[PDB]
């Protein structure tokens, strides 16, 4: 079919859908063209071996006002992650300690080092901000040093550096600390409101959506009805100064005034542009890549850890699994754990057979929470790297030096072509909130000019 619309939107993840929703409200017509047999993108609720799991994005923090607002608008409610009882910390020396409170049970020297690093990052994030970190006078120096090297420059305490790395490298960017810059760490902190917010799992991992995060996209897509096209990978965008023609599998042709590419930036070159994008985009797009993390799901007859006075929370910068949390579904009697294996550790796990990887990861969960962790009734690994329409997790970031070199241009339209994803967002960077904010920002931009 061929259709005429004010705006053609490539991708029905939260960003593309939030944009379509905002455009429709202003009276513009849209078509949303989506590669997969479903909406939601990097958010996805699925049933594996009889257990319902959130395969992708799921958490809502208090700072995420755009997503919170949208949840309310869509009639969706939240619930909080279980956090009663003691957390587990595993030190660099391999000592496991149960604790409560807002600091790891390390010695006083390491605690003071970590406190000072957290304060310095808070200071930098407050000064530099998330909107245009590249514009700050400090940006060049921060962007040309790796976060690893910056931490070495700030502190001689290895355990403090590794823990501070846990929160940004493994915890957020899902790339090793030698591979992204200090400026990118500052961006990540600023985007969540402060570095302190990223340190506190009760903030950044505060809540989930009743019915699952994928319902945000599902409900937006439902309102759009026949303007959403599924199983329709976009192959070609033909464009000039006054419009664009979007071509997708299934003989879909959308003639529009503007186009939104609502896909992560590592996938821009999946599409042929006629004429080609300018050299700026050709070059900039190559310097964006997704991280890698394995989101591990383990389902048990009960949340057994709670019976032992544990919250289900565990941290260990030197473990294959560096974070574990209670991820029990709302009103579920069965317990579910969620755990993360990041970057180079994820590579190492994928080198093993499935059997051996599962055994290794469950051994790591057993180290945190005890031998019952090794007996799940359902076990699943989210494998976003294998998905051709994603290719990693959680989200994209520049290579080292790329943020200051290209950052100013990452949201700039090319003629009628706009870009919208969490991966180029300011506040909410890399998160559903960022996707929503970018969708809304892009819609407002298009509305104002039309």
Q: Which is nearer to a second copy, 314 or 402 (CB)?
A: 402
Q: Which is nearer to a second copy, 148 or 219 (CB)?
A: 148
Q: Is the dihedral of CA 243, 247, 253, 254 positive or negative?
A: negative
Least CB distance to ligand FAD at residue 403 (A): 17
DSSP string over 30-50: EEEE-SSSSS-TT--EEEETT
Q: Which is nearer to ligand FAD, 110 or 214 (CB)?
A: 214
Residue 401 interacts, among ligand FAD, a second copy, none and using kind-specific CB cut-offs from 5 to 8 Å, with a second copy
Please give the Cα distance from 248 to 242 (Å, whole number). Answer: 20
257 is in an annotated binding site: no
What lies within 8 Å, CB to CB, of 88 at 6+ separation is 96, 97, 98, 99, 310, 313, 314, 315, 316, 324, 368, 369
Residue 360 interacts, among ligand FAD, a second copy, none and using kind-specific CB cut-offs from 5 to 8 Å, with none
Cα–Cα distances in angstroms (integers) from residue 411 to residues 40, 42, 100, 265, in the given order: 22, 20, 42, 11
Least CB distance to ligand FAD at residue 308 (A): 26
Instruction: Decide: 77 and 210 in contact? Cβ < 8 Å.
Output: yes
Least CB distance to ligand FAD at residue 123 (A): 25
Q: What DSSP designation does 92 have?
A: T
Least CB distance to a second copy at residue 337 (A): 23
Which residues contact a second copy by CB under 8 A? 144-146, 148-149, 175-176, 178-179, 233, 235, 266-267, 269-270, 272-273, 276-280, 282-283, 286-290, 292, 344, 347, 350, 383, 385-388, 391-392, 399-402, 405
What are the start-end ranges of the H helices in 54-157? 65-74, 108-128, 139-143, 147-154
Instruction: Decide: 409 and 280 in contact? Cβ < 8 Å.
Output: yes
Instruction: Decide: 322 and 342 in contact? Cβ < 8 Å.
Output: yes
Residue 176 interacts, among ligand FAD, a second copy, none and using kind-specific CB cut-offs from 5 to 8 Å, with a second copy
Burial class (CB in 10 A: 0-12, 13-18, 19+), 285: middle
Q: Which is nearer to a second copy, 89 or 273 (CB)?
A: 273
Return binding residues for FAD.
Answer: 15, 34-36, 42, 58-59, 234, 422, 430, 432
Interface residue list for ligand FAD (CB under 6 A)? 10-16, 33-36, 41-43, 56-59, 233-234, 262-264, 267, 270-271, 295, 382, 384, 389-390, 393-395, 421-422, 430-433, 435
């Amino acid at each position: 079919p061929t259709l005429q619309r004010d705006v053609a939107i490539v991708g029905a993840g939260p960003s593309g859908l939030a944009a379509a929703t905002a455009l429709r409200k202003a009276g513009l017509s849209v078509a949303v063209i989506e590669a997969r047999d479903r909406v939601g993108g990097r958010t996805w609720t699925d049933t594996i071996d009889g257990a319902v799991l959130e395969i992708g994005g799921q958490w809502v923090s208090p700072d995420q006002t755009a997503l919170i607002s949208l949840l309310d608008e869509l009639g969706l409610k939240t619930f909080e992650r279980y956090r009663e009882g003691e957390s587990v910390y595993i030190s660099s020396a391999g000592e496991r300690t149960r604790y409560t409170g807002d600091s790891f049970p390390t010695n006083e020297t390491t605690k003071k080092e970590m406190d000072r690093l957290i304060d310095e990052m808070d200071d930098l994030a407050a000064q530099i901000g998330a909107e245009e970190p590249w514009a700050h006078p400090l940006a060049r120096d921060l962007d040309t040093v790796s976060f690893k090297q910056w931490l070495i420059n700030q502190s001689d305490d290895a355990e403090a550096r590794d823990n501070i790395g846990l929160f940004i490298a493994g915890g957020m960017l899902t790339k090793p600390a030698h591979s992204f810059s200090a400026l990118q760490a500052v961006l990540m902190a600023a985007s969540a409101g402060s570095f302190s917010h990223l340190v506190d799992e009760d903030f950044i991992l505060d809540k989930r959506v009743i019915g699952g995060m994928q319902q945000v996209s599902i409900r937006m897509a439902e309102a759009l009805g026949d303007d959403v096209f599924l199983n329709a990978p976009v192959r070609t965008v033909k464009w000039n100064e006054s419009g664009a023609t979007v071509l997708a599998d299934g003989d879909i042709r959308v003639e529009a005034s503007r186009v939104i590419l609502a896909v992560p930036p590592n996938l821009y070159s999946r599409i042929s542009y006629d004429p080609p994008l300018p050299r700026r985009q050709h070059q900039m797009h190559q310097h964006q890549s997704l991280g890698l993390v394995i989101k591990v799901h383990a389902v048990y007859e009960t949340p057994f850890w709670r019976e032992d006075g544990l919250s289900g929370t565990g941290f260990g910068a030197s473990e294959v699994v560096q974070e574990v949390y209670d991820n029990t579904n709302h009103e579920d009697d069965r317990g579910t754990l969620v755990a993360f294996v990041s970057d180079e550790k994820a590579d190492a796990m994928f080198e093993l057979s499935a059997e051996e990887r599962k055994a290794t990861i469950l051994a790591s969960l057993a180290r945190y929470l005890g031998p019952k962790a090794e007996e799940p009734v359902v076990y699943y690994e989210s494998d976003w790297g294998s998905e051709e329409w994603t290719r990693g997790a959680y989200a994209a970031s520049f290579d080292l030096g790329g943020l200051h070199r290209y950052g100013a241009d990452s949201r700039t339209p090319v003629g009628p072509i706009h870009f919208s994803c969490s991966d180029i967002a300011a506040e909410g960077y890399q998160h559903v909130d960022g996707a929503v904010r970018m969708g809304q920002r892009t819609a407002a931009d298009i509305i104002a000019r039309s």
